[PDB]
Amino acid sequence: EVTGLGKLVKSSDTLSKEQVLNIRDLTRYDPGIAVVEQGRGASSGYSIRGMDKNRVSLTVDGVSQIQSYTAQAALGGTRTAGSSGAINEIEYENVKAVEISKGSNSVEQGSGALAGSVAFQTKTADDVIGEGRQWGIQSKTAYSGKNRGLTQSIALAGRIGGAEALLIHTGRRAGEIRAHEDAGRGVQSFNRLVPVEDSSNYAYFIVKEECKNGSYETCKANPKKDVVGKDERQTVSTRDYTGPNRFLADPLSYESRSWLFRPGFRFENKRHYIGGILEHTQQTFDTRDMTVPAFLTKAVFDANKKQAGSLPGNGKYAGNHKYGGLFTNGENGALVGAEYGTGVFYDETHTKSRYGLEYVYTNADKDTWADYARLSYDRQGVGLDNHFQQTHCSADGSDKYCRPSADKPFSYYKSDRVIYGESHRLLQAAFKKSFDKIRHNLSVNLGFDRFGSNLRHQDYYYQHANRAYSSNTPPQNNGKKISPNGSETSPYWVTIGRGNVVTGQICRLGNNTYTDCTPRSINGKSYYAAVRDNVRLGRWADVGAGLRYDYRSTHSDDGSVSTGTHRTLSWNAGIVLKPTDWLDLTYRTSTGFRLPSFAEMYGWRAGVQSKAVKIDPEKSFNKEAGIVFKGDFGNLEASWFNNAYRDLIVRGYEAQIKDGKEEAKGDPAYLNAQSARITGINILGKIDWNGVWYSTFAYNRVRVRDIKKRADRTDIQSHLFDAIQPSRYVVGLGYDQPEGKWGVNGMLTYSKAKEITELLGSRALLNGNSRNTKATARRTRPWYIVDVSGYYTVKKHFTLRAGVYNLLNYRYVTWENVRQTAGGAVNQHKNVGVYNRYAAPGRNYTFSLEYKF
Amino acid sequence: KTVRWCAVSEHEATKCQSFRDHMKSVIPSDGPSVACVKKASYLDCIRAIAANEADAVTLDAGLVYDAYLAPNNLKPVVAEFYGSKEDPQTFYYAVAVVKKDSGFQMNQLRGKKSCHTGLGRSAGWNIPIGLLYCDLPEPRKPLEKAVANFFSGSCAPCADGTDFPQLCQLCPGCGCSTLNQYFGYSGAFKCLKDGAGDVAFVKHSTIFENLANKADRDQYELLCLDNTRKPVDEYKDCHLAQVPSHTVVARSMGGKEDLIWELLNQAQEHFGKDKSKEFQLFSSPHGKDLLFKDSAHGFLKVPPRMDAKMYLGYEYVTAIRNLREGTCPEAPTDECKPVKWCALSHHERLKCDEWSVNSVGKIECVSAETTEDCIAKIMNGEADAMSLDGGFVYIAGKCGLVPVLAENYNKSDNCEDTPEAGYFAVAVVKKSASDLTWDNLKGKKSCHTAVGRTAGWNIPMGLLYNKINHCRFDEFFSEGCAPGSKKDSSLCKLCMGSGLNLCEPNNKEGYYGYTGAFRCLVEKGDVAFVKHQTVPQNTGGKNPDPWAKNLNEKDYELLCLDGTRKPVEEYANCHLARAPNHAVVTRKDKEACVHKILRQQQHLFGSNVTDCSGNFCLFRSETKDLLFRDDTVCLAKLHDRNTYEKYLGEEYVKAVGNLRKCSTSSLLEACTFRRP
Ligand SMILES: *[C@@H]1O[C@H](CO)[C@@H](O[C@@H]2O[C@H](CO)[C@@H](O[C@@H]3O[C@H](CO[C@H]4O[C@H](CO)[C@@H](O[C@@H]5O[C@H](CO)[C@@H](O[C@@H]6O[C@H](CO)[C@H](O)[C@H](O)[C@H]6O)[C@H](O)[C@H]5NC(C)=O)[C@H](O)[C@@H]4O)[C@@H](O)[C@H](O[C@H]4O[C@H](CO)[C@@H](O[C@@H]5O[C@H](CO)[C@@H](O[C@@H]6O[C@H](CO[C@]7(C(=O)O)C[C@H](O)[C@@H](NC(C)=O)[C@H]([C@H](O)[C@H](O)CO)O7)[C@H](O)[C@H](O)[C@H]6O)[C@H](O)[C@H]5NC(C)=O)[C@H](O)[C@@H]4O)[C@@H]3O)[C@H](O)[C@H]2NC(C)=O)[C@H](O)[C@H]1NC(C)=O
Ligand SMILES: *[C@@H]1O[C@H](CO)[C@@H](O[C@@H]2O[C@H](CO)[C@@H](O[C@@H]3O[C@H](CO[C@H]4O[C@H](CO)[C@@H](O[C@@H]5O[C@H](CO)[C@@H](O[C@@H]6O[C@H](CO[C@]7(C(=O)O)C[C@H](O)[C@@H](NC(C)=O)[C@H]([C@H](O)[C@H](O)CO)O7)[C@H](O)[C@H](O)[C@H]6O)[C@H](O)[C@H]5NC(C)=O)[C@H](O)[C@@H]4O)[C@@H](O)[C@H](O[C@H]4O[C@H](CO)[C@@H](O[C@@H]5O[C@H](CO)[C@@H](O)[C@H](O)[C@H]5NC(C)=O)[C@H](O)[C@@H]4O)[C@@H]3O)[C@H](O)[C@H]2NC(C)=O)[C@H](O)[C@H]1NC(C)=O
Ligand SMILES: CCCCCCCCOCCOCCOCCOCCO
Numbered sequence A: 001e002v003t004g005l006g007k008l009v010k011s012s013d014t015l016s017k018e019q020v021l022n023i024r025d026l027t028r029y030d031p032g033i034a035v036v037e038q039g040r041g042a043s044s045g046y047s048i049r050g051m052d053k054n055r056v057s058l059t060v061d062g063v064s065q066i067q068s069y070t071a072q073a074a075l076g077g078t079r080t081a082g083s084s085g086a087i088n089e090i091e092y093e094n095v096k097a098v099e100i101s102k103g104s105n106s107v108e109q110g111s112g113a114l115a116g117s118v119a120f121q122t123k124t125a126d127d128v129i130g131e132g133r134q135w136g137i138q139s140k141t142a143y144s145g146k147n148r149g150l151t152q153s154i155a156l157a158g159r160i161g162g163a164e165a166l167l168i169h170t171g172r173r174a175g176e177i178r179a180h181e182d183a184g185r186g187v188q189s190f191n192r193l194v195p196v197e198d199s200s201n202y203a204y205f206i207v208k209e210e211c212k213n214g215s216y217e218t219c220k221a222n223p224k225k226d227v228v229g230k231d232e233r234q235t236v237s238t239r240d241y242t243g244p245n246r247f248l249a250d251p252l253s254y255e256s257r258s259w260l261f262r263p264g265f266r267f268e269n270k271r272h273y274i275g276g277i278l279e280h281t282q283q284t285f286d287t288r289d290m291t292v293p294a295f296l297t298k299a300v301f302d303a304n305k306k307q308a309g310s311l312p313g314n315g316k317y318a319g320n321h322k323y324g325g326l327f328t329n330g331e332n333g334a335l336v337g338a339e340y341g342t343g344v345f346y347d348e349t350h351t352k353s354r355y356g357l358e359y360v361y362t363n364a365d366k367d368t369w370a371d372y373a374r375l376s377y378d379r380q381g382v383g384l385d386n387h388f389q390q391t392h393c394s395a396d397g398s399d400k401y402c403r404p405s406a407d408k409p410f411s412y413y414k415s416d417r418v419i420y421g422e423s424h425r426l427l428q429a430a431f432k433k434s435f436d437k438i439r440h441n442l443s444v445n446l447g448f449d450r451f452g453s454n455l456r457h458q459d460y461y462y463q464h465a466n467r468a469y470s471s472n473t474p475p476q477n478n479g480k481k482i483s484p485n486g487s488e489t490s491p492y493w494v495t496i497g498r499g500n501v502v503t504g505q506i507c508r509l510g511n512n513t514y515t516d517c518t519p520r521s522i523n524g525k526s527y528y529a530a531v532r533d534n535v536r537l538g539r540w541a542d543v544g545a546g547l548r549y550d551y552r553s554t555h556s557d558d559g560s561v562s563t564g565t566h567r568t569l570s571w572n573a574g575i576v577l578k579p580t581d582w583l584d585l586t587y588r589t590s591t592g593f594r595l596p597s598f599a600e601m602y603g604w605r606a607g608v609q610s611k612a613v614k615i616d617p618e619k620s621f622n623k624e625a626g627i628v629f630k631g632d633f634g635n636l637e638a639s640w641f642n643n644a645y646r647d648l649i650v651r652g653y654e655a656q657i658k659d660g661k662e663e664a665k666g667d668p669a670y671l672n673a674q675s676a677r678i679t680g681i682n683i684l685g686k687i688d689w690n691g692v693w694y695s696t697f698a699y700n701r702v703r704v705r706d707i708k709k710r711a712d713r714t715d716i717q718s719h720l721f722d723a724i725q726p727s728r729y730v731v732g733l734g735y736d737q738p739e740g741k742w743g744v745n746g747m748l749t750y751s752k753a754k755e756i757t758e759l760l761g762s763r764a765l766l767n768g769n770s771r772n773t774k775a776t777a778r779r780t781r782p783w784y785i786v787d788v789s790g791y792y793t794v795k796k797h798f799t800l801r802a803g804v805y806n807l808l809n810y811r812y813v814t815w816e817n818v819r820q821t822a823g824g825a826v827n828q829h830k831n832v833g834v835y836n837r838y839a840a841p842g843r844n845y846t847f848s849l850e851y852k853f
Numbered sequence B: 001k002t003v004r005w006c007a008v009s010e011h012e013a014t015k016c017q018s019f020r021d022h023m024k025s026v027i028p029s030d031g032p033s034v035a036c037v038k039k040a041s042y043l044d045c046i047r048a049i050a051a052n053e054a055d056a057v058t059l060d061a062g063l064v065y066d067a068y069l070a071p072n073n074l075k076p077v078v079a080e081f082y083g084s085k086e087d088p089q090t091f092y093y094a095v096a097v098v099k100k101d102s103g104f105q106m107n108q109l110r111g112k113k114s115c116h117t118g119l120g121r122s123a124g125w126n127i128p129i130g131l132l133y134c135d136l137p138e139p140r141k142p143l144e145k146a147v148a149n150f151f152s153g154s155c156a157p158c159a160d161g162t163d164f165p166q167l168c169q170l171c172p173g174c175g176c177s178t179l180n181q182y183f184g185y186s187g188a189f190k191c192l193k194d195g196a197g198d199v200a201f202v203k204h205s206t207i208f209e210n211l212a213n214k215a216d217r218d219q220y221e222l223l224c225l226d227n228t229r230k231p232v233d234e235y236k237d238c239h240l241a242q243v244p245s246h247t248v249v250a251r252s253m254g255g256k257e258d259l260i261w262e263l264l265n266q267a268q269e270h271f272g273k274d275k276s277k278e279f280q281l282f283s284s285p286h287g288k289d290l291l292f293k294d295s296a297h298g299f300l301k302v303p304p305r306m307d308a309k310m311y312l313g314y315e316y317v318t319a320i321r322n323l324r325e326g327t328c329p330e331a332p333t334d335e336c337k338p339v340k341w342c343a344l345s346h347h348e349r350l351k352c353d354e355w356s357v358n359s360v361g362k363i364e365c366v367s368a369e370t371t372e373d374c375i376a377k378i379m380n381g382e383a384d385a386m387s388l389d390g391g392f393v394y395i396a397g398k399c400g401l402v403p404v405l406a407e408n409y410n411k412s413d414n415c416e417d418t419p420e421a422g423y424f425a426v427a428v429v430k431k432s433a434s435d436l437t438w439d440n441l442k443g444k445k446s447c448h449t450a451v452g453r454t455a456g457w458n459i460p461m462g463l464l465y466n467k468i469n470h471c472r473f474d475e476f477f478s479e480g481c482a483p484g485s486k487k488d489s490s491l492c493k494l495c496m497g498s499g500l501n502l503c504e505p506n507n508k509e510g511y512y513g514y515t516g517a518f519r520c521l522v523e524k525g526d527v528a529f530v531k532h533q534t535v536p537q538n539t540g541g542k543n544p545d546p547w548a549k550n551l552n553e554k555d556y557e558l559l560c561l562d563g564t565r566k567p568v569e570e571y572a573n574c575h576l577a578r579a580p581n582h583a584v585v586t587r588k589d590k591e592a593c594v595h596k597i598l599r600q601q602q603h604l605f606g607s608n609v610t611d612c613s614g615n616f617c618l619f620r621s622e623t624k625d626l627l628f629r630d631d632t633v634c635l636a637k638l639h640d641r642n643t644y645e646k647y648l649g650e651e652y653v654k655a656v657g658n659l660r661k662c663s664t665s666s667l668l669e670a671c672t673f674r675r676p
């Protein structure tokens, strides 16, 4: 049947069977569809048919989720927060089904379905309440060894009516996903500045506070000698090392809590249903960036001197506290001491809140004008809270809570929080009716959404505690004043007091850089109307078609935001010829479009006034032909696709040709600049092995073809296809007992290497000029792994699960990991450095205990 | 060596004699001779000097521009100064006078009513109309009809009242005499004072010559080109254009120039010149302003490095060029044209070329031999911007340029909003070398980076010029090393670098530069005038070379202006003066655009925010420090310190000046001739 081919459906049961707990487990055996790493342990949506992030739509119960938002980066040579960039991960313990669509799909999922779409539907009371029972309670509890991840879930559901209710609570705590034990084991060295007596014969001083009787004249008889820094070699474990040449991923501390409540009422007649929905899930991704050297070295002290010169008080110290003494320039005018190590932290907080009401009209028998209808209202909010923190007030460490204080001279702290959020107030009408011998299945869908996008920038300040110090001319005694030179007989006259703590607010208003903490607020309304129809043309063929209109209007107080009206037209059509040798000849066509994102609308800024520019939507077109052999053996499916993207949005310049020569006009802006097409192949099948158990097969191979840039644009980096998941084979062999008590499964996955052509390119200039550029510094090698899983149930009640993943301890590095280093990656890693840290996990175990009651 | 003049009218042909009559005074052999040559028009004179049958003609600014033009390239050499010597009216100022608080700026002249001194006149017509030429409504030919439809009624005397009625709306008929109440400088001003017009185009002096009272003139203002107003007594900082009154001009490269001055100066002397008897050169028995203007008080020599366009000025040249060539963009998009950067070497030009390519046209490139040649190219408009050290910001500022952006080296979140103060120029001595102070510095051996450089020369000799009023620093110190000085001077008596590189401002001279100057201190000299980072830069091992490997910064102290000494880290209370970091400078009419684009460029190719291995980086260079310093964090905008005096600081300004007027820079000399 036409609706839907090119789909990939997974149920709640399929999920529990494959023991998927992480977002990465979900498409683990589906080649051609991958999860894009966010950089700090989160994720930023999916990657299909060459495109990723905001080019594949992510929906839950008809409501789109958060857009990936990346704020323009800060100048100044310091570490900052930036926006999260992530897209919110769904709690799988709340979903009944998942519908993944490859290729364009805007008629179904609207804006954002350029290259594909991922749609989730939430569970109901019936998914927990058994066949002949009035209530029910389920209980999944799982441990995943690869990230020391415990997950616990309980689901309550009961019905006395009439009235029904569903209540689900899920708690998850995990850590960093560990790597192969050999990749990143061992030891490494680094330097650390330590105090040493200055050898100069002019390095003498006394301090006023240490002159308890008399004065300089009497106290100079006991001078102290200055101190200087020499660094010393130190060796630590790879886990403890801080610096550029890092062997292990940043330590992650992950937590998730999710609440789902869904009350409902069945009326009389049994064809009327009102129901509410209440979801609140929150995740935290807290890391420490170990790429940052904790300890100061002589190399950086000398560097600062070259620029800033020596510092008053250097080498001099209160009491015997030699260490010291040793302090140098930080950032934001701070002086930082060698006795503390610095630490950098990111505390990300992802919160989704959903409140919705629905009315559902079913009708079988089918005597009224609609066999199915649904009115729904949904208020959703998603917030990504990214809190940067830098401390230099501990011996490492590293402390995230320590602060500069008078008793801690030469300490430092910086805070920076960027909060991104979206809201929908979506009103959806869905009607459905079947007409007739040739049966027509008509479908209409209405939509109204009042939406808003908001980025806040706050808690952005520094603090330091610079020491109270002065070097003074001693009192005259007697005759005339003598300014000392630091000799043993003429030591300096110095006073040293405790540090004075200073705060600086970093935020500015209306200056159009990263430090502009004027909230970026974009609001709007939107409408969609969609008519679809699929007909069964006898037994020989089925034909489907769909049409959709989308309107979107946006406003911002900020006149520089690319704001306006869009009206796009989406349509699809498919055919399934069945000459029935139990083989189907399939051919489908669908359009896809993506409106300018909220980050693209805000535009590129360089601390000067910007005009707003018009942005047309990205568009795509997907032709796909396929053949499937079905029968007693099961089925074997193959398809060839051709997706053509157009009006791709990139940062560049408008171009025009005045007197023969082309030239750039306007500002650097986000414009529709490029088109690109991709072709490929998919094989999918399952064998029955009869034969007189089962097997699975899957294969994907994407290729890039034409890449044409618009003649009215320049400074256009072509297109690095680093998003494309490398060609992969995944075969399966497993046995399910017909009784349904136990089962075994074996999975073999083999991925090709990353094609170097997919990450190479050039930047177009004028007139025939260009510059060759690469996406990453490295590409990945081929690899194969085997997973073995099994289960056992004790009749409806207890059911145990166990999986050994990467049985052969194969040491390899995944491409999806290396992608994080690419230019253009959300929260790109730099500068690597050593690629050991991107190693995939070796042999790992997961265990799940499911209870029904 | 004979010097032939040239006269237009047959009346001044007789005025040109003597000749050998009342000028035959103290004639050697072949030198101070003056002949007469007759030609019809003023053009014929310059066309004659183009050959050789003429050598010297005095011209008004309009013809000075004509004489500069090809093929007969003529250069100005001598000017008629008026008034005092302390206040020589060599140039006048074209000015726009308005009533106080009248509510409009220079870019809002459209639809207003104008008062001119007369059609075709310099300050009253050519300059303002020339400067407005592009804003005029097409067709811009004929010019009168265009101006008439740009203003809402004007008094343009000496113009045709019938063909161009609107140009006589404020004065019916356009009287070309005193009969017209609104004629000339005073007449145009009256047209404003009465309220007939909203703006009067006259000379700076006009309002002071028609309004004797301060309170009366307090009711008037001036329009500045930057779209602000200023009081009428600030014309020097608020004028349409500066213009040379009467300028004598020779045939550039290929014609007696120093002989012409030797004449005209000697011709002053013997007031046979004109402030004794016979014959007063300036006044004529049969005519007015015959050979020279009667208002003249004598002559001054135009500085060597002064070409015509630099002499007439950017504003004037721009206005007249518009008036003649008439070339204006038919598509006035009112957006920013490419910024033309100026490169000082092949390596700078290479990097600039790469930048221009990566900047998709927003940056273009021009080269020049020296720093001063580039500044002059920015002045005349052949270039737009370049980065300059504090020293060259002072001279560029005396030449009418402004700083747009400062180079910043501090790592901070708000780098691009906060301009850094800069560094400190200090005097370094050894602690062992007792007894040294700033007072008894006379007779000691000094170490300078190079003569003419900011911290190494200008500032220290600037503080010392207020001790001994003479540019003989050679005879103040015992000896020393100041690379660039005369070979027979005492400031080369202990340099190094064999050959002819001895005492030469380049790295072949081992004592050139900050580093070399400090090396001079530790090996030969006893006091170095250097940067406050210099000593730590070359101690502790940062300088791996043998002469500096074991050196310790704490072996050295600093000379303070109060006669005391402090260690090298106490520079903040022991310096000569504060100097600013490098700054990008440009013309005033480019300030906004340069500001806009350079800030855009650093967000495209800035320090971080890009992979410097894979792409272009603005702040990285194939050798060292090309275009900008290599440790530039970002370019910071300038609010308060947007002028050269405010950017440099009062300490720097008070320090030099003196040493100025005593300087060697020929560019500074040239710009000082125009201001003042
Ligand atoms: C880049 O990089 C570079 C390099 O590094 C850098 O630079 C640097 O910097 C630094 C600083 O930071 C420095 O150092 C410094 O020095 C000084 C001195 O020296 C100097 O000299 C001169 C004079 O002498 C000067 O000049 C100046 O200038 C400046 C600038 O511009 C200015 O400022 C400004 O101004 C303006 C105009 O007017 C305005 O005013 C504003 O406001 C400002 O900003 C000024 O003014 C001037 N002067 C004066 C003074 O005035 C030059 O510049 C030089 O600098 C010294 O002094 C310092 O000191 C430091 O140290 C010490 C020890 O440690 C400490 O302590 C201090 O001390 C004092 C005395 O004793 C004190 O006072 C006191 O006070 C009290 C009161 O209390 C209190 C309370 O209680 O409240 C506390 C607090 O804290 C305070 N403060 C605050 C902030 O808050 C307060 C006060 O009031 C305030 O004012 C408020 O606001 O208070 C009593 O009452 C009395 O008064 C007394 O006793 C104080 O306190 C303290 N302070 C603190 C803060 O604490 C500290 O630490 C200090 O800091 C030093 O040493 C150097 O030199 C430099 N270098 C160079 C090359 O330049 C930069 O930064 C960068 N850049 C960027 C942009 O990034
Ligand atoms: C924003 O933008 C900013 C710019 O605006 C950015 O700042 C810039 O960033 C730069 C990089 O951070 C920064 O630093 C520069 O770094 C170079 C050094 O090069 C880097 O890489 C080196 C190689 O990796 C390395 O250096 C050495 O290398 C040696 C030799 O290998 C190392 O020894 C190794 O160490 C091991 C360790 O032992 C074992 C061990 O642990 O025991 C065995 C053990 O079993 C294993 N463990 C395992 C296997 O598990 C380990 C393991 O193998 C290793 O860990 C693997 O990594 O090791 C042994 O001890 C053994 O010795 C050996 O194997 C040594 O350890 C390395 N040191 C360090 C610190 O690790 C470093 O990683 C280094 O970072 C500096 O040299 C630069 O300085 C110089 O630059 C120029 C160089 O040519 C020079 O310029 C000259 O100047 C002179 C004078 O004027 C003139 O002549 C010219 O002008 C010019 N000359 C020329 C030729 O042109 C000059 O010398 C200068 O000093 C440079 O400083 C850079 O400073 C800044 N830029 C600026 C302007 O500030 C920044 O990134 C951004 N900021 C932010 C916040 O994002
Ligand atoms: C007027 C806005 C109403 C829309 C809110 C609907 C959801 C209510 O919960 C919001 C709080 O939940 C946290 C999500 O963060 C806020 C998202 O909305 C802000 C973006 O404009």
Ligand SMILES: CCCCCCCCOCCOCCOCCOCCO
Pocket (backbone or CB within 6 Å): A773, A774, A776, A777, A778, A779, A780, A781, A811, A812, A813, A835
């Ligand atoms: C424009 C040309 C720039 C070249 C960019 C790519 C450089 C080549 O990459 C090297 C590929 O080798 C990959 C190494 O990665 C895995 C091998 O080691 C894995 C450890 O298990």
